[PDB]
């Protein structure tokens, strides 16, 4: 196979293996409802084999980025339905990444509410823009409060189904709530959700269980980032962590496992792709730093089943055609990743627009 071979993912048929990774762009409205801009932006990218829509707040009152979308309210379901209808009308496929920001939900973004976490320890290697402010110490969740978080993900997953998505991706990565429980640098707690790997993975696995009850497992993916240092994250043994999870996630019959293979900050290095491919029997989606040539190489070698592209798909609405034809890519402008408005969001050109009609 290569990037342009169709692939089965759950019971969906994806047209190609050029997928769009989830990208927070903070273009939702003040009530966290998707906007006309988001409809146009995702519709422009519907030639992707699959779009994974950006981190979306599962539960009310957990903002980390000010204007991210949510999937807890009726207006949000209706807003997201505009997005999924536009993508389907172009023949694309789209999953929703459902997310709880955990200790990254700064009090100043949430009317003074104290964020929750597996342990009362703040993020220290990143700041929040609100002005630029240090993260605060989160409250340690009691064991008895964890059922309401699981229920919150179940309701988010039911709402995502009503909004017309083809499936959901559970956000188990990048230092947010599920990843904070998973990795021992952020999870110091005792009891059934702390200590050994199987306990630290319990919350993620309990979420996957309820979300699969809503959707059927072949419509649920999970994203993991075992080496990412972002938001003060570390595991003391990432190889053992991903090996255990690769084996255990077979039992959930997921649509896919979406593995970020490296560290945003370049501090933690290990080969996590090899033991994940060896032990995980399902669909392996890889991400981080793939070019078209490398992506074809790793699909053809059998090391991954698909590749999710982040910044290249942000900046190239027609990335699959560009990679197919070996045409130069548009350059991304990081200055507009998180601004408001259409500039740097819906105005990156296609090949044919570039040719100036």
Among 1, 120, 122, 315, binds Na ion (CB under 5 A): 120
22 is in an annotated binding site: yes
Residues with Cβ within 8 Å of residue 90, at least 6 apart in sequence: 43, 46, 47
Burial 184-202 (b: 16+ CB within 10 A, else e): bebbebeeebbeebebbbb
Nearer to ligand FMN, 215 or 345 (CB): 345
CA–CA dist 45, 41 (Å, integer): 7
Under rule CB under 5 A, residue 329 binds Na ion: no
Alpha helices in the chain (DSSP H): 36-44, 74-89, 146-162, 177-182, 197-200, 202-215, 238-248, 273-279, 292-300, 311-315, 319-325, 351-354
55 is in an annotated binding site: yes
199 is in an annotated binding site: no
Interface contacts to ligand FMN, rule CB under 6 A: 21-24, 54-55, 97, 171, 173-174, 223, 260, 287-289, 309-312, 337
Q: Which does 295 bind (CB under 5 to 8 A by kind): Na ion, ligand FMN, none?
A: none
Q: Which does 22 bind (CB under 5 to 8 A by kind): Na ion, ligand FMN, none?
A: ligand FMN
24 is in an annotated binding site: yes
Nearest approach, Cβ of 20 to ligand FMN (angstroms)? 9
CA–CA dist 208, 226 (Å, integer): 18
Length of the chain: 357
Under rule CB under 5 A, residue 140 binds Na ion: yes
311 is in an annotated binding site: yes
| Positive/negative CA dihedral, 330, 95, 3, 44 | negative
Nearer to ligand FMN, 189 or 228 (CB): 228
Nearest approach, Cβ of 288 to ligand FMN (angstroms)? 5
CB closest to ligand FMN, residue no? 310
Active site residues: 176
Q: Which does 337 bind (CB under 5 to 8 A by kind): Na ion, ligand FMN, none?
A: ligand FMN
- Burial environment of residue 328 by CB neighbours within 10 A (0 to 12, 13 to 18, 19 or more): exposed
Q: Binding segment for Na ion among 14-22, 23-31, 135-143, 307-315 (CB under 5 A)?
A: 135-143
Under rule CB under 5 A, residue 113 binds Na ion: no
Among 139, 161, 234, 279, binds Na ion (CB under 5 A): 139
CA–CA dist 83, 319 (Å, integer): 20
Residues after which a C–N gap over 2.5 Å breaks the chain: 130
Q: Which of 139, 240, 274, 254 is nearest to 205 (CA)?
A: 254
Nearer to ligand FMN, 79 or 101 (CB): 101
Residue 117 tokens read as: 């976490």
Nearest approach, Cβ of 68 to ligand FMN (angstroms)? 8
Helix H, strand E, coil C: the string for 125-141 is CCEECCCCEECCCCEEC
Q: Binding segment for Na ion among 10-18, 131-139, 286-294, 310-318 (CB under 5 A)?
A: 131-139
Nearer to ligand FMN, 43 or 104 (CB): 104
For binding to Na ion (CB under 5 A), which residues are involved? 120, 139-140
List binding-site positions for FMN: 22, 24, 55, 97, 223, 287, 289, 310-311
List binding-site positions: 22, 24, 55, 97, 223, 287, 289, 310-311
């Amino acid at each position: 196979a290569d990037l342009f071979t169709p692939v089965q993912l759950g019971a969906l048929t994806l047209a190609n293996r050029v997928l769009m990774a989830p990208l927070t762009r903070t273009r939702a409205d003040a009530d966290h409802v998707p906007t006309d801009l988001m409809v146009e932006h995702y519709a422009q990218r519907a030639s992707a084999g699959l779009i994974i829509a950006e981190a979306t707040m599962a539960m009310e009152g957990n903002s980390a980025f000010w204007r991210e979308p949510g999937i807890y309210s009726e207006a949000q379901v209706s807003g997201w339905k505009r997005v999924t209808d536009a993508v389907h009308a172009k023949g694309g496929k789209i999953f929703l990444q459902i997310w709880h920001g955990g200790r990254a939900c700064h009090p100043l973004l949430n009317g003074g509410r104290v964020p929750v976490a597996p342990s009362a320890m703040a993020i220290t290697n990143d700041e929040v823009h609100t002005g630029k402010k240090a993260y605060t110490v989160p409250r340690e969740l009691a064991d008895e409060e964890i059922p309401a978080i699981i229920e919150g993900f179940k309701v988010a997953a039911e709402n995502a189904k009503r909004a017309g998505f083809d499936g959901v991706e559970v956000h188990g990565a990048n230092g947010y709530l599920l990843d904070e429980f998973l990795r021992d640098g952020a999870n110091h707690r005792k009891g059934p959700y702390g200590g050994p790997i199987e306990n630290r993975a319990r919350l993620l696995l309990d979420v996957l269980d309820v979300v699969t009850q809503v959707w059927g497992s072949d419509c649920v993916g999970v994203r993991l980032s075992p080496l990412n240092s972002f938001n003060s994250m570390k595991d003391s043994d990432p190889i053992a962590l991903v090996t255990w999870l690769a084996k255990r996630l077979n039992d959930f019959d997921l649509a896919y496992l979406h593995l970020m293979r490296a560290d945003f900050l370049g501090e933690q290095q290990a080969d996590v792709v090899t033991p994940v491919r060896e032990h995980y029997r399902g669909h392996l989606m890889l991400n981080m730093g793939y070019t078209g040539v490398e992506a074809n190489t790793v699909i053809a070698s059998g090391q991954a089943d698909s590749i999710a592209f982040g910044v290249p798909f942000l900046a190239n609405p027609d990335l699959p055609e560009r990679l197919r034809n070996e045409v130069e890519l548009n350059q991304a402008d990081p200055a507009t990743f998180y601004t408001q408005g259409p500039e740097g969001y819906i105005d990156y050109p296609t090949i044919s627009e570039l040719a100036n009609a």
